[PDB]
Design a protein around this ligand. Structure first.
Ligand SMILES: [Cu+2]
Ligand SMILES: [Cu+2]
Lengths: 620, 620
């Protein structure tokens, strides 16, 4: 039916069959990435043509391939061999993570390092992390993972409490070789346990928390049709899911009167990077591109009712491919529900004697993923008043290290001898805009202070200025909280009743962007993270701010490459890329398990409607 | 019992009796302000002495007085005559707002202005606004109000939709004379009505919203004793109420194990100013000091259950004095309840096999007030993890004007010919700190970027720096969102188990501060609003950032004067004053009644605890 429906188990199995038939999926092949492609711009095919893009890895060392197939037609549209040393390695395979600890367990260098620390190899867990790109020439064209050790005292023990500092190893997960073992010296391994379910640490559980019952007697106010099409309080959209990006929102539109007005064609978190700021050689290479290197959707959690999602929840169970092309369901991976959101509008008028109060509510679409020690929640909200918001929730267990005897300028102490390297969690939201259609433009709006004098004799006046970003070369912007800087996306060809172009205003949190030196590997690989806002001309192959292949890939692809085309963005099909994130200096309160910290952004209508769009909300 | 208990109707009746018998409350006297005084530093003296502070106005022109009485002993502790021309006029009386429209009704100049516009004087409402201090020497020492006109077509009509621009009058509310009527020219009066309950405008009401039921089968998890003492999930505090500041939180403390640890001695919104940025002479003088000039607590609304506050609500009905000393109860003026706040902490560990999820909740204490056209909600939040937060919700009807032909750089258009002058809503949160006691200090923390080179070969390192504010002369700080600037309040004499001073970190939203020219009257009268954070040494008489008598004060009062003392704040009894607000360029969406917009701040524990304080929270 709808070309925006979720991929089905059948479609995935069919893709597997098409690839096998084409001789592209033999025993040595593995699917590193598989996802359905969005319909092309404009009414092309007389009907729908469901296409899937796949990244195929070869465990024998042969070059991988990027393939696009039409599941509808049963054909391979294109198949290209990839030169990874140039364009990037494919995302890490879940099966390659296990390899690291296994290989190191029998490596003489690794064993000697553990022995020097009096550690039992059988109790040493190894965190298999992405390698990035540095000065190791032998790594070019190879699939490498770097391992950091943590001691697990017993089966249910939290290894993160026992980091083994001064040690790191590099492993080629295809040839199954340990390329390097670096030991910079022994550090005491923190002894205190971080078992947050241990009664001795938690103490008696409080019994003071009375129940909060949230229910909907007549069911939810939103409807779900076609499996993933949502209709709620005038909003209309399709909830998609991609193994790389996770939840993706399509065709966000608002029913204004008798017309369905588009606002955002596609909204997603196109990349997420977690750069560490500890200069120690043991972790100075540490940078997680959770989305681009690991694929966050793949690790989405099954959400439990009453615990993860409270109230009347409607679940979606997206299907993804496993390493062999077989479909795998992520049961209850997406939660959908509406929640009360306090007061919407209120006024008690003396002159008219009318007292008016209305309540607000929001539609929530979310999922939670786990990448090693961290767990991130991705939340999208739609409000009655037309506001759209995204919120990321960061929790889990902080990545640890030893805490240096003489303190540290890049690590904080969580417990005796236990340290937490400073780092950031930076996201990139890709917003393929469609304010009342595809003809859009972006204006940077700053508050303008005025000088006391002629025409402003009392010095109370203040104004605002808007600068249209006309070409991609002028569209790489930075925040300016001091001047209340925001960015407005409007449609110069669609005006409200007051003859002004309709628009939506993006309000950022103005948190610090990437802190790394501009000459670092990470500043180049995560270039998008160095600026708050980027605007590009829409293009089918410009999907991620870091390009298609992020794993062990240097600069050269992504946003910097796209912007160079210097295309016209003044009243055209454009895409907004907003960078936002948290800078983390772990506190003692973040140990042994950290309470949620959040960050996000929102867009509010700006002259999009002819008056408040919530005057028809009942008193209830 | 508790010296922090809410005032009783009887205590107010006692003050009235005391003043009366003392001959301080004659027929010409009016109580402009009345509130109970907080206990002085140190209460080692058994049995407190309930004292009340009172501002007495005289309608015959006689000198006003500031009186302090003891309801415990039934005596007048002090009574001092005020020289308003020097120290400022008393707050505006509710009965004075009425005289403006009434007086103008029979003034020839006013009638001539209305006749030229063909407006029925009986239909013209006049907004009685504070006057401030400008170039009118004859106003020094006199109580003046400036009036702006709005047409009300019928009893239930919203006059705000029909502003009468080009006209303004000044009135002496004591001598009851119209000192001036300024008519700069006729402007069309906007014709469209803004009646949000008129089916003609709202259209058919939605029938799509299903109910959301929030209940607590076993009641709330918090306990209320002594009338206003709250105990909830380890938190302890007293909820007070003042006619000027509104809800005030006292003795906020956290039960950590066996110790009841203080965090903040007193928290309140000590001032809220709404400066307008329209250079027109009709409004260039407009600046509302809602707290200081009008007294926000006085206009607190009676909150309806299931309407203003949903769920299991526990109300407090504070009592205030009327203009004659009579007790007046504000039925259900304060809402108190706890609400679910999503995920608190979550981690699914591969190695231990332990999947952990805990939910969060917050304690809410709030009230809503109405000042003419606007309505503001003040919300204080206490979270399980120790976070303290404040949030202001701004709604109501936008103050209007005509929208000039040709447009405007200082007014936005809401409807045909209807304008909305630009303005700001700036709050000042006075936080009398008590981090583990009164010996505190403040440090400004900035993120520090590092250059690639020796000791940072990969250029990935980044750090932080903290600067102690030692004297008041260096305690006037500005925000720096780009460098992630925050402020930490710590106790240098109380250290956590890691030998680090315990503390709390204030996170600001970094919204723009006062925009007016530095030499403007408003910049001098609301100097607190020009900088984000101020730190002062505690003093009994330093209550408001704008001084005790804000109305028609020439400027420089409050914070600027306090800071000038240049006292030692490095490890002393200090007070933090945080400025935060919204800069409003009204959108079409804000008309005819505006959807809530918010702003606030929060403080999070920073090494205050020895580990996460929510490990004892049950799974449920
Ligand atoms: Cu973190
Ligand atoms: Cu406003």
């Amino acid at each position: 039916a709808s070309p925006f429906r979720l991929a089905s188990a059948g479609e995935i199995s069919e893709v597997q069959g098409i690839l096998r038939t084409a001789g592209l999926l033999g025993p040595e092949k593995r699917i590193a990435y598989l996802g359905v492609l969005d319909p092309a711009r404009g009414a092309g095919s007389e009907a729908e043509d469901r296409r899937f893009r796949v990244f195929i890895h070869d465990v024998s060392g042969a070059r991988p391939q990027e393939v696009t197939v039409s599941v509808t037609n049963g054909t391979v549209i294109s198949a290209v061999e990839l030169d990874t040393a140039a364009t990037g390695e494919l995302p890490v395979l879940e099966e390659e993570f296990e390899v690291v600890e296994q290989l190191l367990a029998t490596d003489e260098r690794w064993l000697k390092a553990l022995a020097a620390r009096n550690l039992d190899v059988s109790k040493v867990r190894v965190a298999p992390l992405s390698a990035g790109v540095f000065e190791y020439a032998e790594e070019r064209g190879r699939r490498i993972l770097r391992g950091l050790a943590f001691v697990q005292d017993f089966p249910e023990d939290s290894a993160w409490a026992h980091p083994v500092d001064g040690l790191v190893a590099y492993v080629d997960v295809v040839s199954k070789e340990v390329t390097r073992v670096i030991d910079t010296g022994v550090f005491p391994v923190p002894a205190e346990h971080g078992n947050y379910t241990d009664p001795e640490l938690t103490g008696p559980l409080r019994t003071t928390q009375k129940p909060i019952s949230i229910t909907q007697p007549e069911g939810p106010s939103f409807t779900v049709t076609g499996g993933n099409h949502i209709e709620w309080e005038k909003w209309s959209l399709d909830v998609g899911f991609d193994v790389r990006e996770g939840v993706v929102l399509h065709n966000i539109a608002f029913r204004d009167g008798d017309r369905l007005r588009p606002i955002i064609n596609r909204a997603s978190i196109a990349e997420m990077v977690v750069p560490y700021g500890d200069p120690s050689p043991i972790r100075s290479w540490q940078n997680y591109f959770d989305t681009g290197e690991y694929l966050v959707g793949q690790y989405a959690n099954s959400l439990e009712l009453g615990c993860d999602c409270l109230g009347d929840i409607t679940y979606l169970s997206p299907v993804i491919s496993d390493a062999f092309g077989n479909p795998r369901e992520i049961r209850n991976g997406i939660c959908m529900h509406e929640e009360d959101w306090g007061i919407l509008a209120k006024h008690s008028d003396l002159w008219s004697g009318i007292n008016y109060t209305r309540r607000n509510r929001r539609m929530v679409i979310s999922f939670f993923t786990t990448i090693g020690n961290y767990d991130y929640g991705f939340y999208w909200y739609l409000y009655l008043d037309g506001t759209i918001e995204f919120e990321a929730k960061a929790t889990g267990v902080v990545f640890t290290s030893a805490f240096p005897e003489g303190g540290s300028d890049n690590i904080s102490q969580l417990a005796p001898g236990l340290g937490a390297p400073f780092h950031q969690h930076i996201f990139s939201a890709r917003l393929d805009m469609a304010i009342d259609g595809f003809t859009n433009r972006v204006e940077e709006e700053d508050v303008v202070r005025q000088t006391m004098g002629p025409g402003n004799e009392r010095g109370n006046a203040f104004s605002r200025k808007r600068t249209v970003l006309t070409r991609e070369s002028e569209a790489v912007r930075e925040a300016d909280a001091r001047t209340g800087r925001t960015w407005i996306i409007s449609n110069p060809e669609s005006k409200n009743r007051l003859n002004e172009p309709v628009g939506y205003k993006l309000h950022a949190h103005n948190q610090p962007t990437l802190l790394a030196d501009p000459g670092s590997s990470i500043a180049r690989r995560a270039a998008f993270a160095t600026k708050d806002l980027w605007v590009t001309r829409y293009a089918d192959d410009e999907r991620y701010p870091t390009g298609d292949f992020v794993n062990q890939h240097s600069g050269g692809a992504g946003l910097p490459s796209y912007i160079a085309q210097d295309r016209d963005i003044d009243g055209q099909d454009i895409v907004v890329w907003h960078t936002f994130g948290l800078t983390h200096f772990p506190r003692v309160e973040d140990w042994p398990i950290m309470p949620v910290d959040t960050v996000g952004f929102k867009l509010r209508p700006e002259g999009f409607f002819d008056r408040s769009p919530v005057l028809d909300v009942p008193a209830n």
